[PDB]
Amino acid sequence: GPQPISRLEQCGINANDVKKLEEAGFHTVEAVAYAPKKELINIKGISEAKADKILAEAAKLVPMGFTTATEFHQRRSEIIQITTGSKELDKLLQGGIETGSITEMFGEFRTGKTQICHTLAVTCQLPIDRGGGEGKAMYIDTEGTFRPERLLAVAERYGLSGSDVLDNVAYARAFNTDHQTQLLYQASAMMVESRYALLIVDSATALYRTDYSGRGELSARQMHLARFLRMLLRLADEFGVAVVITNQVVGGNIIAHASTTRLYLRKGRGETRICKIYAEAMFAINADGVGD
Amino acid sequence: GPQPISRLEQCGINANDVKKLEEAGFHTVEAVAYAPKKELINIKGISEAKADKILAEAAKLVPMGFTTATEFHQRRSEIIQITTGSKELDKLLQGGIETGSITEMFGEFRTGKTQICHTLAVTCQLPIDRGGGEGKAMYIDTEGTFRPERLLAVAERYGLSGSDVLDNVAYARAFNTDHQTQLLYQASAMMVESRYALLIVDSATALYRTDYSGRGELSARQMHLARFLRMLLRLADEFGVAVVITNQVVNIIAHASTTRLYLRKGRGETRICKIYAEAMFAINADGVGD
Amino acid sequence: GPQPISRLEQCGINANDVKKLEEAGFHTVEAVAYAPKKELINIKGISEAKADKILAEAAKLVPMGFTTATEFHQRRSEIIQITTGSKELDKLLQGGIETGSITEMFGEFRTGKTQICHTLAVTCQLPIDRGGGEGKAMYIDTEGTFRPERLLAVAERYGLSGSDVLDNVAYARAFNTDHQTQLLYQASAMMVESRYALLIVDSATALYRTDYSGRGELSARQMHLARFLRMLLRLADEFGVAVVITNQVVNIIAHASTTRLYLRKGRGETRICKIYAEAMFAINADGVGD
Amino acid sequence: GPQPISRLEQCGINANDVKKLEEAGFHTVEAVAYAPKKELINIKGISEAKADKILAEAAKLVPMGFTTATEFHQRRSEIIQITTGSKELDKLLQGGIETGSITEMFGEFRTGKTQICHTLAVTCQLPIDRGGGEGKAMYIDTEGTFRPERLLAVAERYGLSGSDVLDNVAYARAFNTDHQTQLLYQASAMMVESRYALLIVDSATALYRTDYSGRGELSARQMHLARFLRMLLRLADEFGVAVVITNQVVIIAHASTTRLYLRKGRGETRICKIYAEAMFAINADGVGD
Amino acid sequence: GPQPISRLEQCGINANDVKKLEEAGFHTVEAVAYAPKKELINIKGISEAKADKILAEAAKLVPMGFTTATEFHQRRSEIIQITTGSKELDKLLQGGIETGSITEMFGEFRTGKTQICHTLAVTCQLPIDRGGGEGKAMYIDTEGTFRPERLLAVAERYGLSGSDVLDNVAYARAFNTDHQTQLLYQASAMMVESRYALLIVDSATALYRTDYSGRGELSARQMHLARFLRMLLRLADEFGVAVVITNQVVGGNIIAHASTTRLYLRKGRGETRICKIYAEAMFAINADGVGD
Amino acid sequence: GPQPISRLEQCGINANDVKKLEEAGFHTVEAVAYAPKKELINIKGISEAKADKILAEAAKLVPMGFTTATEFHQRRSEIIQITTGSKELDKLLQGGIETGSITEMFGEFRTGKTQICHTLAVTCQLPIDRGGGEGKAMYIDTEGTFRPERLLAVAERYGLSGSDVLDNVAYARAFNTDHQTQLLYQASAMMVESRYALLIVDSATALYRTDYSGRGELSARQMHLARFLRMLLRLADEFGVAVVITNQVVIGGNIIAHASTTRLYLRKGRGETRICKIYAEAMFAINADGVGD
Ligand SMILES: Nc1ncnc2c1ncn2[C@@H]1O[C@H](COP(=O)(O)OP(=O)(O)O)[C@@H](O)[C@H]1O
Ligand SMILES: Nc1ncnc2c1ncn2[C@@H]1O[C@H](COP(=O)(O)OP(=O)(O)O)[C@@H](O)[C@H]1O
Ligand SMILES: Nc1ncnc2c1ncn2[C@@H]1O[C@H](COP(=O)(O)OP(=O)(O)O)[C@@H](O)[C@H]1O
Ligand SMILES: Nc1ncnc2c1ncn2[C@@H]1O[C@H](COP(=O)(O)OP(=O)(O)O)[C@@H](O)[C@H]1O
Ligand SMILES: Nc1ncnc2c1ncn2[C@@H]1O[C@H](COP(=O)(O)OP(=O)(O)O)[C@@H](O)[C@H]1O
Ligand SMILES: Nc1ncnc2c1ncn2[C@@H]1O[C@H](COP(=O)(O)OP(=O)(O)O)[C@@H](O)[C@H]1O
Ligand SMILES: [Mg+2]
Ligand SMILES: [Mg+2]
Ligand SMILES: [Mg+2]
Ligand SMILES: [Mg+2]
Ligand SMILES: [Mg+2]
Ligand SMILES: [Mg+2]
């Protein structure tokens, strides 16, 4: 799928200019092509002639022209469409979470948004014919709640081995608003080496709340969240990873425009745990992930 | 050894600046690495270039990148699980107090939340095989209920030396709502000189309730207590220390407590403990175990 | 012991900022340290720079950090531990009333609660070796029952001079609810220059119930009583005075207490007490019996 | 500065040019000398050579060169130090309001800053021996709080004729923001005929808070107030007249040589901080108690 | 007295530039002179040179220079100082309400503020030698309480003819917040045309209270009220009318800086209707205006 | 004719916007003239220039400037002054209910406040010389007490044909709080469709008492009732229609005190002999044929 920068080297001065793109945040040739000229100019050590040469060579490897809608329909076909463990949720989402798009989640507290993230991180490693995209998840946590013991229980019901499933999953444990951004930098390098399917960013707004209490800092955090969200859209594009964002309610803001699908959750007086497409489906939290 | 900040000095670090970072609150290279660039700039006398250099070197002394989930699993199979006595009959906590995470406590009054804090303060200094933390406790009293005689009474139950239990506890009464905050700043300095396995706040809200009695304040009480809790998480993970908070019953103040523990008055001496599982725990003359 | 506020002066603008804090109630450097930035900046005439400076200088004088329990055990040892005049009652409180604690008292009426206060008032003057702390009483009366005739009568029982005994004791005779509040500020002013031991506030709640008119002020009355005891604990802790509260029966006055001495009744003259154990003591013309 | 622009006229000056320069705001040669080439070239009808010759003759009249520190100390020993009556009690300002400087005040409301301005307006007319300035004041009211009856009463306390106290005081209410600058220009014009000793602005920032309501014109207000303060500094420096500015507490930080903060005290007794304290009481006949 | 803009024509172009100032709000030459440059610039159709010419002609027309304090003292004399119908109030106010200054009023309800507004309106028509200033009142009502029969009764008490006292009094009946400002703009015309003495704004804060209930509109209503008060002060200074403002209590805030005097009222219980200069005085509402 | 809004459609009015204003709540040019620019802007689909033009054309068709007190006195000596019945003896209101101004009512229970509401609804139909309103009422029941049989009885007491007294009363029960506001919106058009002389609310606080019960809202009920009363004042002083509001007592000055220019508080006096005093005295009875004893 994705094509590394190493292919871009053609009189481009290897190992003196390729890394200047590597620490710039670009890790694939298509990432450079999908990057503006000004994004390459502001990088130190890249001249106007050299930046033009890189973009000219980048456009040669990846196609950025006009394609007919029939070609796009089949490209939008064969989408991985990883499952979610619940039959009703599977029917409601027309096959679960779709790759290449950010799927947000909402809730008040103890609504299962962290819980259904765990059952996704294991089901993304299932083969295509039985749901997920046989990849590896990249769970990122901010409010520390990652419990690998839960992955053992949910992997047991699907017949997967308990050892192999943990090797595929990657953990981040972000601590600051900025540290989330450099995690995506290390994410892009990791996406090239191995096939990945999920980019769970559980509690993607928890950090922004804790260290931006200043009333005059709203304009600062709005742009910071926009850059983080914008970097999520692109990262989903080259690699086709179903980015999942968990957010705290206590509906519609700068995070909404970037998002493709939302799955507002809350409890219920009866039968518990319904979902929305802010359509309703039935799901519940059992010992082994989600159930009916 | 959780990497003290003295190891960050280089030619450009200008170790006179280490004391400038030390007075800010960051006494650990993990603290500055986990500190955002925003609060490095807010420190007076630190420039944009200086802050970048501090963060750049702090990054290469601690693992700040990704890790495989199987590595994190065995890093969870190292929790101390400090013993408590009679509450963990059939192991409601599955081992004991969760180290590296706050364990908040509730109750109405005369329930026994303060009493097991005394027992927790003597258990954490027991050897690991018996259920201890092999480290010395830390008490931050807030209402003035600290009784060092109780520590001696429970010490003889486990056979530990009476003289060796009092010198281990680091007691500090909090007369103020802000005095709690800078006690934690003084705490991080003390956590690197020796090994502490338990931090206890006798009442995280007693002075917040009485000092902030104004009708208008309300909101001001929130982010002040939020900063108190956000530092408790900061001390919890870069030292691997168990934090116990007791509160009086009858962002938010409910997102930081990894574990909760509500308490009830049963029939007579039969104390009741519940989690928001229930167990029989008592308050004997020599501790909590029945 | 307590350090007078005048020592705080080091470029601190004498008689203009020290005097400004004098009417604020902060008459010792301990009071300044034990007070937040809030009411130091709420005092008119103090800016943010001055408030920070006076707090910084106050911190350097009194210790505010962490101390080992061994230091606190000795500190909580050698307490004055004022006697109560009754040997059976003496051992039941393992030494009688203890300083630094708001020892409340209960009853119905004619229960001896005022009687033992007068006995406790004469005995605060005794030397360490046989009871009291060689200090002066600071009786505060609301429901007028202070009869100095009793003090001279009990003085000859213990063999003390009947003239110097009344010279040491103070007398307030509070009238209004706001009057009780401002006496405590004046109490701290006169506290510094003399060794004081006892702070009887006899009938500390019967004055408020006089002002209790209608149901539309219960919220305000509790808040006023909240900071009345808050000052008392803020006054006993950093001056080491044995505050005694005498309430009448049939987070208010329940949390701030340290000991209670319910005074049920008996067989007419067989007065007894609780620690809400029983102690046998008689009430006669010369104070109360042993 | 008893050195008028009239004496600048010469054979080559073409004294009609003096009148033409007067409208620019310059009425003393000390004003043109202290003004750069920029402030003279922008005046219509003045050529480069004319400005050069004007500045050369101004330099030949007033000296701008260096001076020994002893002479500077001696000339700063000749400060009038207009008295107040209760603020100066216990020698808070070591004499009172000093001439040649801006003495900005503060206050929340009813703190007494207007009343002490009234007291100063009559104390400046005292003979220098008693603590006055031997010059007529100048009141620039903005919020309409001027009351000559209070001036007459306070003059009665100090024992002066009421008619001579009032007719010396000059009054002018300012309605517009630019009206304040025009009033300062007229003040510079009229400062040369008679010896003045005090300039009172009742509330310099009052008109800026109401004329410049919103729509983000903050920068305009900022440099307009900067120009006002620079004009006042130039006036005080060239004429040696004490300048007093009051401000309303809910720029003016670099020009306030002495800064005062008035805040409510106990009853009629009030406290005054030098942003260091004193008891000033506002009586029925002034401030001195 | 006040001088109309029609005298401003010296190559000022009548019916094309004078009318622009008239529709902008200014109706007298001193209104233009007491107005800043930008208040003339922001009006469409007036250039910088035209504004300079208008300001210069106004400045030579009216005197905006320095005046000796003796002249201002004699100008503080001959103030109309209209009476109020109560000898106690007459002595307390040192002659009653004074022209050129807003006299605010406070009260809970049924305190007599509208009643004494009515007696002021009737008594402002008296000749100089016996109280009022032989002018015309302009009672502006927001919460409809204007009762002309009360004016008839009180005028009969004072001996004035009942026909003329109605002929001189003017009524507004404001409905909206902007309607008050438009009413003052229209009131400037009657200021120019005829001699006027009173500008009652009875319940000047009732409309602002009733149509600004939104918690997010406090800044807007404060700015509107500030503009309204500044307009009242400029009108009073221009024409020397005794503006009286009636306010509803249920202490002090931004409104007193523009105000000159306040007459806080209270019920009084025994003998009732006691007032302050927030010094005290006692008045009584008879069937005929105010009395003892 | 209180100037219906349909006359405001000029070349620049875009008569679809006229219907937009009509559904907004304003049905007369007087309503939009007495309307601040703020709420016209908040009407979704009206631009700043369009709102300016609407206000400008509203201003030049209705008088909004100053008027001499003689003109206002003449415009006040034309109140319709609807009669009441038995209270005709010793006129306390100097003729009866004041037109164009709310006449609030009180009483504990069983007093008869609803009965004289029926009598007012029938007397609004009497000719002017007889003391009526020459119009049709609007009873808005909020407690389910409206009974057309009493209307028939009182109509035959004054000798009016029943079919002519029934066809004019516009009954509308309220099940809700916002239903009252919607009813006022609908009544705004009914005012211009035909002449109306009285508006009656059976209990303006009955629904507010039962729909809002929690301690939480309180202020919500407060400004909801404030908006209700403001709408009532606007309709009354725009359309020249008397408004009568009855309330449940068990009391004095509150939000509805400022809005009601007049009161009439009723007591269960000596049996059949009821007593009414304004917040004077008048004794009236409630017979089978209405009020007149
Ligand atoms: N093994 C399990 N069996 C049944 N229910 C569970 C299990 N684990 C968790 N739950 C329930 O699922 C919920 C998960 O909440 P969570 O999603 O972590 O909260 P948040 O959305 O605030 O992060 C808990 O409230 C818990 O009651
Ligand atoms: N020696 C003892 N024997 C039995 N019970 C005790 C003994 N000492 C203390 N307790 C009990 O332990 C409890 C401790 O209460 P504590 O937790 O300190 O109250 P708080 O929660 O208000 O701090 C008391 O209610 C008391 O009944
Ligand atoms: N000299 C005495 N002889 C005998 N009995 C006494 C003497 N003095 C006091 N008493 C008894 O002690 C009681 C004192 O009442 P007291 O408890 O002081 O009232 P309060 O309830 O206000 O404290 C009286 O009931 C009295 O019977
Ligand atoms: N004759 C007097 N006797 C006592 N106090 C007075 C007298 N006249 C004025 N004052 C006091 O002087 C103060 C004047 O306030 P002022 O400085 O005019 O307010 P502002 O600073 O807003 O202009 C008033 O608060 C008043 O209390
Ligand atoms: N003819 C009269 N005789 C005596 N008193 C009257 C007469 N008319 C009105 N009043 C009294 O004067 C007061 C006027 O109140 P008013 O000031 O109009 O209320 P608000 O302050 O709400 O406008 C009423 O309380 C009334 O009692
Ligand atoms: N024919 C009649 N004779 C005597 N009394 C009657 C007659 N008809 C009605 N009433 C009285 O009129 C009263 C009307 O009460 P009403 O005002 O409807 O109560 P509410 O105030 O709850 O609406 C009743 O209490 C009833 O006693
Ligand atoms: Mg969750
Ligand atoms: Mg307890
Ligand atoms: Mg007693
Ligand atoms: Mg003042
Ligand atoms: Mg009134
Ligand atoms: Mg009834």
Residue numbers in the entry:
A (entry chain G), E (entry chain C): 21 to 270, 288 to 315, 323 to 336
B (entry chain F), C (entry chain E): 21 to 270, 290 to 315, 323 to 336
D (entry chain D): 21 to 270, 291 to 315, 323 to 336
F (entry chain B): 21 to 270, 287 to 315, 323 to 336
Reproduce the article's own wording on this structure.
Homologous recombination (HR) mediated by ATP-dependent DNA recombinases, such as prokaryotic RecA and eukaryotic RAD51, plays an essential role in the maintenance of genome stability by repairing double-stranded DNA breaks (DSBs) and related lesions. Although it is not required for strand exchange, ATP hydrolysis is involved in the filament disassembly, which is required before repair-mediated DNA synthesis by polymerase.
Although the individual filament of the hRAD51–ADP double-filament extends the length ~24% compared to the hRAD51–ATP filament (from a helical rise of 15.8 Å to 19.6 Å), it takes two filaments to form hRAD51–ADP double-filament. As a result, the overall filament length is reduced to ~62% (the helical rise changes from 15.8 Å to 9.8 Å). The protomers in ATP-bound and ADP-bound states undergo minimal overall conformational changes, with a root-mean-square deviation of Cα of 0.9 Å, indicating that major conformational changes occur only at inter-protomer interfaces, not within the protomer. Upon ATP hydrolysis, while the ADP nucleotide is still bound to the Walker A motif, the loss of γ-phosphate eliminates interactions between Q268 and D316* and further destabilizes the R130 interactions with Y315* and E322*, resulting in loop Y315*–E322* moving away from the adenosine moiety of the nucleotide. These local changes open up the inter-protomer interface with a rotation angle of 19° and extend the hRAD51 filament. Taken together, the movement of Loop 1 and Loop 2 in the ADP-bound state dislodges Arg235, Val273, and Asp274 from inter-triplet spacing allowing the extended ssDNA or dsDNA inside the filament to transform back to the original length.
